[PDB]
Design a protein around this ligand. Structure first.
Ligand SMILES: Nc1ncnc2c1ncn2[C@@H]1O[C@H](COP(=O)(O)OP(=O)(O)OP(=O)(O)O)[C@@H](O)[C@H]1O
Ligand SMILES: Nc1ccc(-c2cc(Cl)c(Cl)c3[nH]c4c(c23)CN(C(=O)CO)CC4)cn1
Ligand SMILES: [Mg+2]
Ligand SMILES: [Mg+2]
Ligand SMILES: [Zn+2]
Length: 360
């Protein structure tokens, strides 16, 4: 309770850090957008800010930003890849007008690897010409859909090409976004009338990938739900309606980062990400729909509700994608049994002992 409040104070971002960091990102992102808008393929490219900074749940330091460079793609037709629910081939319908994206077609299929390789090539050419800002491209590992840049040896930015489709959401999402009892059926209907996005992350095929495939993304809806998160339309707009939803997500994020640090010696928790705690947090919001279940004075119990549900996901080896229910973030194809059992034991110990990982 009071220990958690002190943790949240420590996690607060400094306004001086926010300002200098955003300015460095803006300088790079703006320069990259200008160049890309000169290419015919990436002509109508547009900025879409996503991830924890723009959801206001980034913790500790503003040193990681996520942006999508969305491309409006009309007349788009999807073909699910091998029942994976999240990965798709992209096609166009009947060539009614000739395409800007025709150079990336492998037959009738729009190749994600071709589009991403050219996107990456342009950004690489551009970063070694920026206004005396030190910018370096990093390719981690894990098949990220992003081009990752390090600015001033300090600030990471993920730049993700994303196709924008204004069509109805794919059938695999029909039972997802279960917000009806929390944010209302009205809101769910309005949200599902919004575009969805496809990012160039490929389905796995042995040692390699299906290099034409794309993956569904609802990162923009995640931001909208986090920034408009109450049952009451005035949640967090006045002194009588201060909930602790965002504080709970922040604490979950910090719990995971701290444990990943304490297990750096064998990198046992390497496969776990903040997106796992984010997804579990959205499910707890569905389970606890009332703002009164997130009262600021109940921070300790609400965080406990969050921790217990995440443990249950670990122990049952099931964490459903909030938008695609049959996509299991915790399947053995993605995270091994040993890793999940390991994190369960640690979170179990931390909970039973009032989170010593949070002591100063
Ligand atoms: N496994 C995934 N499935 C679907 N979307 C993902 C996945 N991993 C990341 N994302 C999307 O990418 C965005 C940026 O991811 P990132 O790893 O930067 O985490 P984040 O939410 O920004 O939190 P933080 O950066 O503070 O760890 C996420 O908000 C999420 O929308
Ligand atoms: N700006 C954005 C937003 C959404 C996505 C993204 C989308 C989908 Cl669908 C999946 Cl499966 C994704 N996996 C990862 C990302 C991602 C992005 N990513 C990181 O941000 C690491 O910090 C790597 C891991 C990408 N960039
Ligand atoms: Mg991020
Ligand atoms: Mg990121
Ligand atoms: Zn609120």
């Amino acid at each position: 309770a009071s220990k958690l409040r002190a943790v949240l104070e420590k996690l607060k971002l400094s306004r001086d850090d926010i300002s200098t960091a955003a300015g460095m990102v803006k300088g790079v992102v703006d320069h990259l957008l200008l160049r890309l808008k000169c290419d015919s393929a990436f002509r109508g490219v547009g900025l879409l800010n996503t991830g924890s900074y723009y959801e206001h749940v980034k913790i500790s330091a503003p040193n990681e930003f996520d942006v999508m460079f969305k491309l409006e793609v009309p007349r788009i037709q999807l073909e699910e890849y091998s029942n994976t629910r999240a990965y798709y081939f992209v096609k166009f319908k009947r060539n009614p007008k000739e395409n800007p994206l025709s150079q990336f077609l492998e037959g009738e299929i729009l190749s994600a690897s071709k589009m991403l390789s050219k996107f990456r090539k342009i950004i690489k050419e551009e970063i070694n010409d920026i206004k005396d800002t030190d910018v370096i491209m990093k390719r981690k590992r894990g098949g990220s859909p992003a081009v990752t840049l390090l600015i001033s040896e300090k600030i990471s930015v993920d730049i993700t090409l994303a196709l924008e489709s204004k069509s109805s959401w794919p059938a695999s999402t029909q039972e997802g976004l279960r917000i009806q009892n929390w944010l209302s059926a009205k809101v769910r209907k309005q949200l599902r009338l919004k575009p969805f996005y496809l990012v160039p992350k490929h389905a796995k095929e042995g040692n390699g990938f299906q290099e034409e495939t794309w993956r569904l993304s609802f990162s923009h809806i995640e931001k909208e739900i986090l920034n408009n998160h109450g049952k009451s339309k005035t949640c967090c707009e006045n002194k009588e309606e201060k909930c602790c939803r965002k504080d709970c997500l922040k604490l979950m994020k910090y719990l995971l980062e701290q444990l990943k640090e304490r297990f750096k010696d064998k990198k046992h928790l390497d496969k776990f990400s903040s997106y796992h705690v984010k997804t579990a947090f959205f499910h707890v919001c569905t389970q606890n729909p009332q703002d009164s279940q997130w009262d600021r004075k109940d921070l300790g119990l609400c965080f406990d509700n969050c921790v217990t549900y995440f443990l249950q996901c670990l122990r049952t080896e099931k964490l459903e994608n909030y938008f695609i229910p049959e996509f299991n973030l915790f399947s053995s194809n993605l995270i091994d049994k040993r890793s999940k059992e390991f994190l369960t034991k640690q979170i179990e110990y931390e909970r039973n002992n009032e989170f010593p990982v949070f002591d100063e």
